[PDB]
Design a protein around this nucleic acid. Structure first.
Lengths: 197, 106, 50, 51, 127, 61, 172
RNA sequence: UUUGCUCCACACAAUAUAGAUGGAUACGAAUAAGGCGUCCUUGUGGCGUCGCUGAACCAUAGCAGGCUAGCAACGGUGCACUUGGCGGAAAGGCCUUGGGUGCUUGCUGGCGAAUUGCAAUGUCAUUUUGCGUGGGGAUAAAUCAUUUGUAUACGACUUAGA
RNA sequence: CCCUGAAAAUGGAUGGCGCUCAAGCGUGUUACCUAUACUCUACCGUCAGGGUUGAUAUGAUGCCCUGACGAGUAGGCAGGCGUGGAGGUCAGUGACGAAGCCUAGACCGUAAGGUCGGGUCGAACGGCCUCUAGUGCAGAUCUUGGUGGUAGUAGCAAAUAU
RNA sequence: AACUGGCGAUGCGGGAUGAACCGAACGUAGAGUUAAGGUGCCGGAAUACACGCUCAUCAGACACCACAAAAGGUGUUAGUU
RNA sequence: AAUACUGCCAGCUGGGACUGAGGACUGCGACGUAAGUCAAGGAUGCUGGCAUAAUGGUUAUAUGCCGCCCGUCUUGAAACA
RNA sequence: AAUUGUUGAAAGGGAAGGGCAUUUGAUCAGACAUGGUGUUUUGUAU
């Protein structure tokens, strides 16, 4: 339905988002993941910090620079979730990894474009209320991400830059929802309601 | 009009396969907007063209085509099976195919 | 390497004389026939009644 | 040469079964039974229903 | 033209090359059955080469038939060409490879008069 | 796959033709194969099956 | 087999020249069809009397429908079950419209609570609890109060597409 | 370096496409809560309304979209000029003032379409070069050879030399 | 069910990613996926049962019909392909080019292989029927001859020295 | 050692992987349907439905099989007196 | 009284897929008073395009999945035999 | 023939090689363009 949708990572379970994301890449769809620092993982924070430290212990013994690269960014933690869910060792999976961009915050030009959600991968619609969940920004800061503060600073700039956009968007929406009702109660309006619009 | 589309877009997902064996004779097509096999029953028998581009011209066109048709549904999620005259090249796992509305039944 | 018949034009005319006289008796159908059908974005031919 | 299925292909179904034309005309696969009003006994009914 | 024939199906158009024929130069192109105790070709593992079975045998009506629809007959002189005069619609003449250039034109002229199709009319053309 | 109750593709174990290249014997086989097929009498069947027989199975009388 | 029905299966011994006309044993059997129902009948009749399927005879099998299958009623079910470390009797109340639906609910619950399959469960009795203020389980007793009123918070909604566009709500 | 190089515009040729075939259509936060509208003696407020899927909204009729006569207006939408901004996270895009011009299906007309012959995507897009038109802009470095030793197996490094 | 009990040495394994009203566990209803399995059809081969000569089909181990089958080491049998030579025959081919050899050039055969076209070449060689054997090679730390990678590599550094 | 079935000699689907396990034995193709196993993605197939249990600061995840015991827990859920 | 469920129809009908094998007739049958026709012992009819690299073949490459290096000894070989 | 040189073609992220299927590039045979429903041979076989 769209050449590229931009998926918000806010309130998303990581593996449940990455699985439907990985199916979308292998079905020839370009998708971009923004706000990967607000991704959620089910389980306690100490459970997932110990889970990452178990992963971080795994490195090649004779040479550490060619081993498993334990990436500490939330975008690259999410990228590590995609790998394994995609057949990245073949040229089809390399093309699937080529069509995917995962980002911290919402960088340009994706700040001024429509962010979609995956409702059956959301933490709200999948976790039982009362379970403990870990946000990816807090987890990545504990394991070695050095950029929690600047992504939080740039998101604070982007949030008010988009709040003023929505302020004039409400102004135009108020004007157009007054104008259509002003153009209503006529022959063209009642006929269009009769057909079903 | 700026829209001249008489077909519906579909994605060539993969070959009809087992876990470790694929059969390139019949392919799997995910038609856009279709989610049930009951609503995918409309699309059986309809023609599928994989429309692609080569570099040199053959009959006055760089556009070439592989023709096929939907044979049956495949699964519970609107994926259908398509048999082509010449099979799909397996580089098109995710390319757009065109499911025309002919042969129609309306 | 590589002309319309005058008989083809005239029988098309006398078919059109009968056909137009009932096309115009209902509103907006002449505009409907002069338009061309196309599948838009989001419409699904398995649920669009024609 | 080629086997043709009965219960489709009515000419093969009429090559077999000379009663098939009478069966189709008289609708003997969908015959109405005779209406009767026999009531089950109370001893069978209360055995079925008890406890 | 020939008499009509069934649609030809080769049923394995690919040549049955020998196992490891391109790995080793001492292993020739021609097919030998692998008779080893541990060979995956003889054991017919999935993903390996197919061996010649009788299932791949062509149809009896379309056996020894060219894509022109003819059985090839290797002729050498005009006396061999007289045997295909009444059998033009099945047998196409083929000039033998050791026929001289001055003797090929007399057979080509005779076969063109007799209506016998020649599969190799361009062999040893002097120009 | 089927339960093989016996040996599949088993030859009958009997001679359908003489092993000889005798042209005159094969002419007598040709005549008596016609006689066994076109007569209901089992005499022509017995003579044909005995014409197939080898030298150790045709003793002198 | 949890698309259950309730059957009465009646059976007796084979009639002999010395003792004909046997005692005609009947019992109610919850099974998905008549073949399991006759099998479970001969199972429990071998648990009770010296008779087997060859020495016995099925005289009647009848599907029991509820006279009021659309009335909510408390079902006190006495059940024994074989565990990994022994056998126990127990007694659970199931609030359902049907005696069959209560047995379906117990078979799901006993597999969930004690890992007890259809293999290791014998339904001793299904008694309809006639009144209230006699149920002695709080998970049934809480539904038998005046003017029952409770919400279902945190509604999940079924999505027909992979991507949504509205950040979907959860109100209900 | 057979008057080299780069950038604006155009024709023409390639090879090349992980796959255009109306539209990325932009708040944030919470979900056991929110959005929207309105009001106030402006709040962690009152009232009304909505959701229960985007099956939406915008756009969408015209020889793949021609020619043309008008009707009520002052809109809409390209293409360029231009007033100014905003945006550094990969900004390279978004918004606005005004003029010019093409179209307008908001409404009424008239002409044209065929023969691609009963379908053949029936070709219209998106990248990068390579030959030429006609304008603009710029007018060098590096390596080797010699030399130094803050360096050095050799390369490298680090120097110096019109 | 979960937890403690529960500690091994390269880094690491529900197969991986991950999964928490599960993508865990127990159970149940269906829907769906697909094996060379089952069914149907075609073709190949084998086996079995048959049919086919009062003038007719190239004259019968042929042709045709029906049906069932088809895994395979050691092994057995059968039908064929190929090489050297021999007896016949094609009044066979050939200096207007035989045999050989090369041919990501065609055709036939399930295949063994055969055939053809082009290039080189220069003197003999094939088809069919049959006979004969020093008759088919990928292996034997095979034999002989030749050629590689290693590799322009190790080395050409004792005897004072040019 | 006994009965039987397999591997040897046997490919194919599944058990990620494996001579033996499960299914099923194999001419060459086409179509359909299943078996064993599965349907989040890799990976074809329901992020299906229903009833519950479990939150683990070494969870658990399918037989062969690639491990876990005695004992204890007002952890929690059912139940018996 | 309906309806659910189970079952039957020698009930009708729509949509799809794959196959077209044989080559005078015979045979069984159906409809028709007969004559003949037919879904009755296997596909014909109509139409269009191209007539060549279009389709097909070979070969190379790319892609999807599979594919351990052969011979031998062995119960077992890809073996660090 | 091994092996090598040049040219041409193609490919190349810790192998290459192979099978099923197709794309793309290169290359290659077949029809039918048949004595053919005939049609006065310019002092009667196109």
């Amino acid at each position: 339905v769209e050449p590229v949708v931009v998926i918000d990572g806010k309130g998303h379970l990581v593996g449940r988002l990455a699985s439907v994301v990985a199916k979308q890449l292998l079905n020839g769809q370009k998708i971009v993941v923004v706000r990967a620092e607000e991704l959620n993982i089910s389980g306690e924070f100490f459970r997932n910090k110990l889970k990452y430290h178990d992963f971080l212990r795994k490195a090649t013994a004779f040479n550490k620079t060619r081993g498993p690269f334990h990436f500490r960014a939330p975008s690259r933690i999410f990228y590590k979730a995609l790998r394994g869910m995609v057949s990245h060792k073949t040229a089809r999976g390399k093309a699937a990894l080529e069509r995917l961009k995962v980002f911290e915050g919402i960088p340009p030009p994706y700040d001024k474009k429509k962010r979609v959600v995956v409702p059956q991968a959301l933490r709200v619609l999948r976790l039982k209320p009362g379970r403990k969940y870990t946000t990816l920004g807090k987890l990545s800061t504990s394991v070695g991400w050095k950029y929690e503060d600047v992504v939080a600073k740039l998101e604070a700039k982007r949030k008010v830059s988009s709040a003023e956009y929505y302020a004039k968007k409400r102004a135009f929406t108020k004007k157009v929802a007054s104008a259509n009702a002003t153009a209503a109660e006529s022959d063209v309006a009642k006929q269009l309601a009769a057909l079903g619009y | 009009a700026e829209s001249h589309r008489l077909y519906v877009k579909g994605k060539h997902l993969s070959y009809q396969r087992s876990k470790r064996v694929n059969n390139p004779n019949v392919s799997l097509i995910k038609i856009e907007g279709v989610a049930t096999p009951q609503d995918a029953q409309f699309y059986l028998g309809k023609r599928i063209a994989y429309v692609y581009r080569a570099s040199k011209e053959v009959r006055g066109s760089k556009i070439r085509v592989m023709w096929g048709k939907v044979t049956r549904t495949h699964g519970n999620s609107g994926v259908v099976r398509a048999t082509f005259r010449n099979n799909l090249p397996a580089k098109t796992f995710g390319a757009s195919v065109r499911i025309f509305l002919y042969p129609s039944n309306i | 390497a590589k002309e319309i018949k005058a008989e083809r034009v005239e029988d098309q005319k006398v078919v059109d004389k009968a056909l137009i006289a009932e096309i115009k008796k209902t509103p907006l159908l002449k505009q409907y026939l002069s338009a061309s059908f196309s599948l838009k974005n989001g419409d699904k031919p398995h649920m669009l009644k024609f | 040469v080629l086997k043709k299925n009965p219960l489709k292909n009515k000419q093969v179904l009429l090559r077999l079964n000379p009663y098939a034309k009478v069966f189709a005309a008289e609708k003997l696969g969908s015959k109405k039974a005779e209406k009767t009003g026999t009531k089950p006994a109370a001893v069978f009914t209360e055995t079925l229903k008890h406890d | 033209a020939s008499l009509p024939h069934p649609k030809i199906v080769k049923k394995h158009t690919k040549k049955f090359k020998r196992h490891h024929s391109d790995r080793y130069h001492r292993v020739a192109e021609n097919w030998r059955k692998q008779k080893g105790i541990d060979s995956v070709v003889r054991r017919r593992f999935r993903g390996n080469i197919s061996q010649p079975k009788i299932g791949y045998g062509s149809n009896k009506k379309t056996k020894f038939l060219s894509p022109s629809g003819h059985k090839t007959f290797l002729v050498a002189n005009v006396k061999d060409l007289e045997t295909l005069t009444m059998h033009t619609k099945t047998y196409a003449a083929e000039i033998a490879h050791n026929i001289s250039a001055k003797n090929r034109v007399v057979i080509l002229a005779r076969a063109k008069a007799l209506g016998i199709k020649v599969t190799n009319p361009k062999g040893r053309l002097a120009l | 796959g089927i339960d093989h109750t016996s040996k599949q593709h088993k030859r009958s174990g009997h001679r359908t033709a003489p092993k000889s290249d005798n042209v005159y014997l094969k002419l007598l086989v040709k005549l008596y194969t016609f006689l066994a097929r076109r007569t209901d009498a089992p005499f022509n069947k017995v003579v044909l099956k005995a014409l197939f027989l080898s030298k150790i199975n045709r003793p002198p009388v | 087999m949890a698309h259950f029905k309730e059957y009465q299966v009646i059976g007796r011994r084979l009639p002999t020249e010395s003792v004909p006309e046997p005692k005609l044993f009947r019992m109610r059997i919850f099974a998905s069809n008549e073949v399991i129902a006759k099998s479970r009948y001969w199972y429990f009749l071998q648990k009770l009397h010296k008779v087997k399927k060859a020495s016995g005879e099925i005289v009647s099998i009848n599907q029991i429908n509820e006279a009021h299958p659309t009335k909510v009623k408390n079902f006190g079910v006495w059940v024994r079950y074989d565990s990994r470390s022994g056998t126990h009797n127990m007694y659970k109340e199931i609030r359902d419209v049907s005696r069959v639906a209560a047995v379906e609910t117990l078979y799901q619950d006993m597999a969930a609570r004690h890992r007890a399959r259809f293999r290791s469960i014998h339904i001793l009795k299904v008694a309809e609890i006639e009144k209230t203020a006699d149920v002695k389980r709080q998970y049934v007793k809480q539904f038998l109060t005046k003017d029952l009123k409770f919400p279902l918070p945190h509604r999940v909604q079924k999505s027909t597409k992979t991507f949504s566009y509205k950040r979907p709500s959860t109100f209900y």
